[PDB]
Design a protein around this ligand. Structure first.
Ligand SMILES: Nc1ncnc2c1ncn2[C@@H]1O[C@H](COP(=O)(O)OP(=O)(O)O)[C@@H](O)[C@H]1O
Ligand SMILES: Nc1ncnc2c1ncn2[C@@H]1O[C@H](COP(=O)(O)OP(=O)(O)O)[C@@H](O)[C@H]1O
Ligand SMILES: Nc1ncnc2c1ncn2[C@@H]1O[C@H](COP(=O)(O)OP(=O)(O)O)[C@@H](O)[C@H]1O
Ligand SMILES: [Mg+2]
Ligand SMILES: [Mg+2]
Ligand SMILES: [Mg+2]
Lengths: 516, 516, 516, 47
């Protein structure tokens, strides 16, 4: 008496640790396999409040399930990083990790030691990164035709794919518009708005922003063209000093005299705004009810208490500087928009700031018939925005449809040849694992994976076509590049690296100690 | 509104059914894996009443665990059939079954259909039986030297290992003595008696039986040389009729006349026993206290209320007929023993009937320091009795130490060459499965399974020594036949056939429906 | 998925199984360590009913604590076998076993594999058996001087050692009297009776038996010298036919005719008894009130309803034959005793049958002041009866005081030198293990075990004195054989073999599966 | 497996809906019937 390790504790050692980690990995991957590719299927997730999510999106599915198992959670990180770094290929990354674990089990069940597997996987992964660089094709950041294929490939298999061609052109225009002066893409600069409507086809690109506000006074113009826009973050209210101040009145004449001073300085603020030439104003803080009246009189459209996020989008869009002192307001701080207009959209009043010339932020207004139909269109739009952004930044793409995984697998087996000993088993195992992609694409399409894999391999053999993959509709193997099925290099480099690193980490584990 | 299938029911379909059966199978196999071979280790099982079994014995371990899982139950019956048909090779069969399941999982994960693996397994199993027949060596039913190697191979890797030479010779003598006219061996004719003592080495063969009795009267001899043994199925008591009969006495003098008539009937019975030449008697029923006296008077040793199963073995051992009517007893119904003796063994009084000339039942008196030590010696002896019995009946043996499994794998792979399509994978998988035996023998011995296998296979390649196996002590691959490591053909044929049949049955399942 | 192995199950694998078995074993040994040798102390065990045992006796201690741990139970079997086969040395067997487990753990902790340990232990144990045969001294079964030292050595260190000279003499006479024709000694032939008294020194050997009965009629003599004893196992009442019988009476004068015939049948039965020459009678069954009168008239002492166990010892002590029909009794069935007397002992009246000439059974009548004092005396008498019996049967003794273990140890190290491989470590460990006895003898005496060990080895080194051991009083090393500290060879051969066998068995275990 | 309409819900259709509304109506009317007119009677209500 008594126990050295805590009594309320579960433990799994050696084969049992390897087993639960590997198993949990595999089951997580099996959960999303069927979502993969053109013939992929969707999941309906219901949470404990009864709120529902319907999606094809790998990382969304994994986040929404309430996975508690520790090894499963390790693999879900693979999807989260894929989502952050690329914005697409989350199912792929996770499915590859799952297969890496499966492949490793057959090695462990041969008494190949875990460190040897981990070593072979590291070597295979590193070789894979070198091979991907030679496999990739270069593209120019302005090649709208290729960018459009990138986007269409991304949206294929989603639901929104009925509206694929129009969506993809919008997306390409949207991303091109926010590329910065170092050639980087901040996807935060593409504002997403989701509004029910007549159909998915009504989705449009707005060169500018939607502000969920109404002008502060009905007397202001509802619409203004070639507007001159003032952006203020100071409140258009009576200015108080920071030092504590109080007025003392002893003469009943000074009563109205202070009142009249306060309303003149208010009228002075408005006159200072009018003076800049502005005819549209967005104030981040509040505007005095009296200033509203004056503004209304001077024919100036104004919205108050605008969230900072919008203020910042407005600046990017119209080219205005957010000014912090009314006194400092200058005509050179004003932004420009073709049209500013208060409109109802699906019974919602909003201020459209649109038709800006070279906007640095833009808005995609996504339409659809129901809330849930729109939700899934928006996820597909995000995938596409992500991959178009990667392509513009990296200027490297690869063919899709599992073509690249097959070329990769084949080259890695060549490389395994020159590896001595057991490590060779692991390198081959890594090679074999990548084929889970072509195999899964075929399965989901109801095709026979084994025989299609034989054809696709033979089309890669010798100096074959690195772009050869299975067309899931025809059933033929085809030049995926020529059919416009393409993906950014970054999808694959990230997915494979993530899969390798997280599985290497899991395979190093020989002991699981769970509390409670 | 109401459910169609019972609501208190768990169901597992497709991949999920396959996964649970395959897993339950693999886990069952790996529990007993470490018991295999010369370097195998034992298990201690404690039941819910606190009783303990420590054993190496595969089927014993599997029954003693109280496995509930349905698929696991299915391959436990592989062990039970092996025990019933052969008496040895119970972990081998189960470990082969688990590996067949593991290799099938690999095939299912490549979308090979279950019915195809089943078809390939059936083909490989059938080829295996054919290859086994040509591999086997013929031996004669009375080749003591080979039977001795058969028994010794069986006892290797148990606690009783230290005394295997003496034990094997005893066992070979024991089994050869009970061989019947059809050349058949009935294990039940070898009575196993377990008694604490000085040493495992004090274990001895008795050509005769041990009866758990004392002679009915201490006036009787407690030792008889060249005994003439009578065996009575009836009570030596006053015989009453089946028809209800009653005595009426009206004359006081008739009292004594009846008492004296009964007393004479008893004396007549004993008189008839004495006349047959019997000087020893075993009675299945009661002996009247009064009859006891007369038997003692006549110098006849007698035991009463002997168990019917004892009477039967006594008859088998001494060559006596169990008689049911004292009047019918003749000298010709008497059996013979060189020595009948009442004596104490480890504190217990028993009657030894021994030195019988050509016993048809025989007794092995197993000695050991403690009860649990003795239990495990008895289990070892049982294995050995089983395989010596198989060899005598079948006249066919194979070399052991995994040499035969490697020969099988190698030949099956050759067979797989000429098999077209997908079924070929299943046949190769079956071939790879059999190597679990040489692999497990090496790993229990702390050796590297992968390199061990490379060497053993090389020794089988071309032509090629079908008997080549790994000596787990030296680490050299040697001729197992020359080293006397041999087992009956029936061990392999039964083990492989049941492993195949049970896993084929499991692989056919696509739906598990579990009530309550 | 469901679980495969049942879920109520605790399981300890590899290092954990070894640890729990090794520990459980060791703790069992350590609880009795302090009882060992002439300076040993006693335990008081209280059970859940409040009943008390106090004792030095190792097996009794282990039986009485209700040990449930599975590995502990296996070691306790060691004590039980020591008790059954030898009757002494139970603490020694268990202490050696515990130390063997302790020494094995040191080899396991430096990575020696368990099968090598057990192989080394099996080798040392076998060697030790053959060394013990050369160490033993020959002794004659009728050498009373040596039997007396054997009994005295046994009694040393127990409550009773104050009375150890008269006791030992009594025990030597008792056991010598019951040696059978084959030269064997059945302990059951020495009846132990325990009765409160003035003192432990009032203990006496009765050449006869003590029967817990009173004579059936006070009109019978209480004393008979030179008795002729009849033993009946049939009642002395009117004999009823086996077949159902009813008297029918139509003449009123027949009422008396039958009644009188029945009391004539009684006189007759008694007169048959007297005709034999019997003046004392022991009946296993009842004795008609009227028979009791007739018997008493004839001056015959009769007890009724005597235990069948009593009848049997009566026959063995007096030479009488238990007779089943009064019609059979004759002068030759009668037993002899110098004295038969009904008398009070501890206020209980009993029948003493004593001063028999050639008793084949005798009675130790153990006296002592309190029940618990007496219980412990009887335990010590049992031990001494066992060892005296062993010496009579075996004619082989060794010196005590740990001298034989030191001799054995020294010789085993020599042997070990010729052992090549890792098994050498195990053989040395076994050798060292045996020294737990001289070391414990000295610890319990408060001496310095390490120092005294150096001295005793030195006296055994060269070709010195195999009989040299430490005198726990004197503090010196001397010839123990000369000091008359001696014990049967059988104590050591059984204790070492049991300890070896049960620990080899535990060391083979790599997996503990405990239900519930 | 799950119900579409809430499971904690009582539903009355066709004749059953008609019968319950008609009945509830008639019963309400007949509670006050006896108050009507010059010879109407009163009610005592206790809360
Ligand atoms: N037209 C097509 N034909 C074949 N494969 C395609 C096609 N379009 C996309 N794919 C493949 O589908 C996979 C991505 O599918 P998706 O369901 O979006 O999963 P992920 O979440 O991993 O991006 C990629 O391997 C891509 O090559
Ligand atoms: N001396 C030996 N060397 C190598 N292998 C052996 C030796 N003796 C037995 N074996 C092998 O051990 C296996 C049987 O071990 P065992 O633990 O009894 O399992 P099972 O319950 O299946 O019979 C067989 O392959 C047999 O050939
Ligand atoms: N006079 C003595 N001097 C030294 N050792 C003795 C003496 N008498 C007995 N012993 C030793 O005591 C040990 C037995 O002690 P005991 O408590 O009876 O244990 P056990 O139940 O194992 O016999 C033996 O090793 C014996 O040699
Ligand atoms: Mg995608
Ligand atoms: Mg076996
Ligand atoms: Mg003792």
């Amino acid at each position: 008496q008594p126990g050295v390790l805590p009594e309320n504790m579960k433990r799994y050692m050696g084969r049992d640790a390897q087993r639960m980690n590997i198993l949990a990995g595999r089951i997580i991957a099996e959960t999303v396999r069927s979502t993969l590719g053109p013939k992929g299927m969707d999941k309906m997730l219901v949470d404990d409040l009864g709120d529902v999510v319907v999606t094809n999106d790998g990382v969304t599915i994994l986040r929404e399930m309430s996975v508690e198992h520790p090894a499963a959670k390790m693999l879900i990180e693979v999807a989260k990083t894929q989502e952050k770094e690329v914005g697409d290929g989350t199912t792929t990354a996770v499915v590859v990790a799952g297969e890496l674990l499966r492949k490793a089990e057959e090695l462990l069940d041969q008494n190949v030691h875990p460190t040897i597997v981990v070593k072979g996987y590291q070597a295979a992964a590193q070789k894979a990164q070198e091979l991907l660089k030679t496999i990739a094709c270069e593209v120019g950041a302005q090649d709208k035709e290729i960018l459009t294929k990138i986007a269409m490939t991304s949206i294929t298999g989603k639901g929104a794919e009925k509206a694929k061609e129009k969506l993809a052109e919008i997306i390409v225009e949207a991303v091109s518009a926010v590329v910065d002066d170092e050639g980087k893409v901040d996807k935060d600069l593409i504002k997403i708005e989701k509004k029910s409507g007549a159909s998915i086809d009504d989705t449009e690109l707005i060169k500018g922003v939607l502000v969920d506000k109404e002008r502060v006074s009905a007397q202001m113009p509802k619409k203004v063209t070639d507007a001159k826009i003032a952006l203020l973050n100071c409140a258009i209210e009576i200015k108080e000093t920071e030092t504590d101040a109080e007025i003392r009145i002893t003469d009943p004449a000074k009563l109205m005299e202070f009142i009249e001073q306060e309303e003149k300085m208010l009228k002075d603020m408005v006159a200072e705004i009018k003076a800049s030439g502005a005819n549209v104003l967005f104030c981040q803080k509040g505007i005095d009810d009296l200033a509203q009246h004056y503004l209304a009189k001077e024919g100036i459209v104004a919205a108050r208490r605008v969230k900072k996020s919008d203020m910042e989008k407005l600046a990017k869009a119209t080219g205005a500087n957010v000014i912090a002192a009314i006194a400092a307001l200058s005509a050179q701080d004003l932004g420009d928009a073709g049209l500013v207009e208060e409109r109802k959209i699906s019974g919602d009043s909003m201020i459209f700031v649109e038709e800006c010339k070279h906007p640095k932020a833009v808005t995609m207004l996504i339409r659809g018939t129901t809330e849930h139909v729109i939700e899934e269109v928006a996820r597909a739009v995000d995938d596409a925005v992500g991959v178009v952004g990667c392509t513009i930044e990296d200027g490297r793409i690869v063919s899709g449809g599992g073509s690249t995984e097959v070329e990769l697998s084949m080259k890695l087996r060549e490389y395994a040849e020159g590896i001595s000993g057991r490590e060779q088993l692991a390198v081959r195992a890594f090679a074999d694992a990548l084929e889970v992609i072509p195999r899964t694409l075929a399965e989901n399409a109801g095709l026979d994976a084994i025989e299609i894999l034989v054809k696709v391999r033979a089309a890669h053999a010798s100096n074959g076509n690195k772009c050869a993959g299975l067309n899931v509709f025809t059933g033929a193997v085809e030049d995926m590049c020529e059919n416009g099925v393409v993906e950014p290099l970054r999808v694959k480099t990230q997915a494979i690296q993530s899969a390798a690193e997280s599985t290497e980490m899991l395979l190093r584990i020989d002991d699981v100690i769970a509390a409670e």
